[PDB]
Ligand binder design. Sequence first.
Ligand code: HEM
Ligand code: HEM
Ligand code: HEM
Ligand code: HEM
Lengths: 146, 146, 142, 142
Amino acid sequence: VEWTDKERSIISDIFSHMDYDDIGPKALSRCLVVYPWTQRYFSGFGNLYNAEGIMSNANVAAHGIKVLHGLDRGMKNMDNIADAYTDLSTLHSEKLHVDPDNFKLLSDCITIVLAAKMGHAFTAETQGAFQKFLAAVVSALGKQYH
Amino acid sequence: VEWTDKERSIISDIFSHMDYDDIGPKALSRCLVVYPWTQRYFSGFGNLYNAEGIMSNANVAAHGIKVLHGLDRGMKNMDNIADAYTDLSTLHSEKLHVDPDNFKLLSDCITIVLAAKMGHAFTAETQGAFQKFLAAVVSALGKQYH
Amino acid sequence: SLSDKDKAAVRALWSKIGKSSDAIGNDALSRMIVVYPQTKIYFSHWPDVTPGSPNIKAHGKKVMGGIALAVSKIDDLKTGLMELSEQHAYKLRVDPSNFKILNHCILVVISTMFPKEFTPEAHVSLDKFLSGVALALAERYR
Amino acid sequence: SLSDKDKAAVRALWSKIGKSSDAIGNDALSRMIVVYPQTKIYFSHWPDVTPGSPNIKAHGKKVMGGIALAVSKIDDLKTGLMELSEQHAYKLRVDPSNFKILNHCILVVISTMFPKEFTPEAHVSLDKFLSGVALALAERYR
Ligand code: HEM
Ligand code: HEM
Ligand code: HEM
Ligand code: HEM
């Protein structure tokens, strides 16, 4: 949508210091237990049976890191995020058949994990900028569903 | 944005035969009984005490007939619904202090009342275009909130 | 939660419209996949991902079958629908947000079909009830 | 519904973080008015819709007091929060949708403040609990 310079810098900061290797596994892990229905999409991933099992599941660590990177295009073309997700939207709908509501659930986990990591740095102004960015990306992910 | 010609016609069809003096009162009353918290904004309206009383409250009727006409600009300004309601948004936000969640609830009530009326002719496809239009209107109404 | 008043209203409406459960179900699910295409993912393994389908006829049937049961189990949905909860839970794994979508489509259909009977009083009690069923369907999710 | 495990998980977390109930409330409501400004309307009877404000610090204090109450009443929230429901109902008339928004702000604050304590397990149970609370606060609305 329309971005203020502040949001641009806030978004720029967060990604600059993001430990994709730490946030990604933990954000995807937290999603799989907090919203167990999301497990269906990861049939071959192995142990998704309880908290422990998800928490130490290699398939999930690696994929979370991946999921988080998927955002990278967005903040890298902040004025063209919808178009930037044309393909993934198509991938997610027609190839993977993923209920886009999960986009919002995982977005929320990502937000909750970034907050644990950033602590006091996760100010209200930072939460707003991050959620705004994520909502925009979520909209873009479910564009191609028809 | 973006409307198929079909959607354009359906909306024009719907409004062409819309009995505002009938649908309007019925939509706002139903909203006030199923989502009673919306009764808060109609304090000067008088008797809200029960369903019957809401159903036969003239002030509610006249205001419902009015709210539905509010939609008129949107349907006559289909490719610019954001801009068309910017003022109304501000009115609802800064003057009336209306919780924009009730915008979705009322669209729902409107939607279901028109459905009672149009009956079997209220097809899935017709519903989809009316909800789409109603959605854009609801988006346009809550933009000026900050 | 549902008051006695809510329980009565739901029971009265259903004794009035229950006969048409089959039309309501086909119509409701058909609407669902039309107005909310994203819900099609749960059926992307079916040879009729379109309205009035044999499977849309089927699932619609079973869904209104749950509604009939939920009414009979209106005094304790959680206990009355646990079995259903696990099918959609561990088995089907449907995001609960879709229940709100279906519930909405069911009120539109009933309205299209029984406008005299679907008064606002019946609507609110029914809305309340369908929220109760969905939450009941979600019992075994996490 | 909250399982024993859920009731256990919420109780343990609240015994661990309860000391900071005052800070959690101020921070949560501040976040709410900043990130979801539309919620400001309910407080528009004050020209003071800002984080860490005396009026903001206060309500938050009262909010977390209601949350500690709900923990103490965790075995029956519906009964435990009748009074609380009545206030936001007939009096304030808060759209029940804002409870969800506040709940999210509450999880973020706790996340920022107790990162070791806020495990996913404590998350799922706390999240389940706050939806229970939300549904409890809505009991007298309709
Ligand atoms: C912020 C939201 C999300 C983003 C940005 C995102 C991004 C991505 C990316 C970049 C890929 C890999 C593309 C490729 O390998 O060609 C992917 C794959 C996938 N995503 Fe999403 N995803 C999101 C949410 C979700 C959610 C919530 C689920 C389901 C719960 C999901 C399910 C999958 C699956 C099953 C795959 C395929 C695994 C593979 O073989 O790589 N995604 N996603
Ligand atoms: C489709 C969504 C809606 C539309 C298009 C709409 C439109 C309108 C219009 C055209 C007016 C009259 C402006 C004036 O005379 O100054 C109005 C006023 C008002 N609206 Fe809305 N409205 C909508 C939803 C709502 C909802 C959901 C509520 C609260 C439950 C609400 C509460 C009010 C109130 C309290 C007034 C002032 C009454 C008066 O004119 O004295 N509106 N709205
Ligand atoms: C009123 C709400 C609903 C009720 C009462 C209901 C009931 C049922 C029942 C009784 C079954 C049969 C399973 C068995 O007996 O083994 C079933 C299966 C199923 N349900 Fe639901 N359902 C509802 C809503 C939904 C929704 C909203 C969705 C997704 C949009 C959904 C997706 C499915 C699927 C994919 C199946 C598998 C069976 C098939 O191939 O048709 N259901 N449901
Ligand atoms: C966790 C959920 C909540 C709890 C436990 C809670 C609790 C309370 C309590 C204990 C009071 C004090 C009443 C009094 O002072 O007489 C109160 C009042 C109030 N609440 Fe809530 N509240 C919650 C959510 C909300 C939300 C989401 C809103 C806004 C949308 C809100 C708006 C108000 C207002 C405007 C008042 C009046 C000021 C006052 O406290 O006197 N509350 N609430």
